Amino acid sequence: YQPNYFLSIPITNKKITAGIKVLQNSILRQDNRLTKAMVGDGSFHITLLVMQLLNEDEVNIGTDALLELKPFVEEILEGKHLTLPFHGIGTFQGQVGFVKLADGDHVSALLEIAETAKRTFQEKGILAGESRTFKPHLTFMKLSKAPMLWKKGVRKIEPGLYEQFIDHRFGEEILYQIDLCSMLKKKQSNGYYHCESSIVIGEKD
Numbered sequence: 724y725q726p727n728y729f730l731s732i733p734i735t736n737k738k739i740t741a742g743i744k745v746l747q748n749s750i751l752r753q754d755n756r757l758t759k760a761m762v763g764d765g766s767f768h769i770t771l772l773v774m775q776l777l778n779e780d781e782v783n784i785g786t787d788a789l790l791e792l793k794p795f796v797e798e799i800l801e802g803k804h805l806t807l808p809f810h811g812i813g814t815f816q817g818q819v820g821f822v823k824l825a826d827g828d829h830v831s832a833l834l835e836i837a838e839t840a841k842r843t844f845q846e847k848g849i850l851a852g853e854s855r856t857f858k859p860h861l862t863f864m865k866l867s868k869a870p871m872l873w874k875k876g877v878r879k880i881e882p883g884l885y886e887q888f889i890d891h892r893f894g895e896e897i898l899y900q901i902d903l904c905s906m907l908k909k910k911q912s913n914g915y916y917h918c919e920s921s922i923v924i925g926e927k928d
């Protein structure tokens with residue numbers, strides 16, 4: 724199925740977004756045709772779960788399911804914070820470029836949150852989740868965003884464009900928020916996706 728909504732972990736740690744800005748600009752000075760493939764400023768996130776929300780009532784149900792997920796996330800983390808380290812560069816088949824979540828204990832916890840997200844949402848009657856294995860990543864570019872490159876001379880991201888950053892520590896994000904976002908509505912003025920609702924992670928209540 725084709726989702727139109729997702730759970731999003733916003734990656735706003737200044738160091739991370741700044742390092743990605745430098746990455747993106749370095750690529751663009753090498754080949755300015757890649758401009759439209761770059762994800763926009765303010766849009767950086769990790770996708771936690773995809774889903775379909777097809778009317779106003781389901782959207783409101785989506786919001787209720789997100790609220791319910793909150794206590795489940797803190798049980799999984801055992802009264803601790805989740806630290807997401809972002810280090811180096813990967814691609815899905817040269818078509819999507821992303822900063823890679825480093826390996827650690829945090830990876831399994833993240834997977835457990837994603838799986839608990841899917842179950843929480845489905846039990847509310849929401850088509851949520853994918854069959855594909857969950858591979859968290861922080862996208863900085865996707866060629867599908869610039870469909871004119873396919874027709875032009877550009878059918879993959881040249882690994883030479885980012886060679887200087889393949890080992891680069893972008894920084895660490897502590898999980899602080901989960902957003903319910905529209906994939907298709909107009910973005911906020913700050914460049915983030917349209918946000919139906921949000922919950923806080925990692926703070927005193």
Ligand SMILES: Nc1ccn([C@H]2O[C@@H](COP(=O)(O)O)[C@@H](O)[C@H]2O)c(=O)n1
Pocket residue numbers: 768769770815819855856857858861862865
């Ligand atoms: N395992 C995965 C997970 C996501 N993807 C994606 O790359 C994505 C860009 O990443 P985000 O939307 O999650 O930032 C999607 O457009 C989808 O094509 C993939 O190609 N393989």
